[PDB]
Design a protein around this ligand. Structure first.
Ligand SMILES: [Zn+2]
Length: 33
């Protein structure tokens, strides 16, 4: 994916993942941990 991609922390559970995977993680985490 060496083109354009950022990774950030999950405000709910505190994990680092790419922009697509993190948005989904924190969305599902806002419900369950
Ligand atoms: Zn999460």
């Amino acid at each position: 994916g060496s083109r354009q991609v950022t990774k950030v922390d999950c405000p709910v559970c505190g994990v680092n993942i790419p922009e697509s995977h993190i948005n989904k993680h924190l969305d599902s985490c806002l419900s369950r941990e």
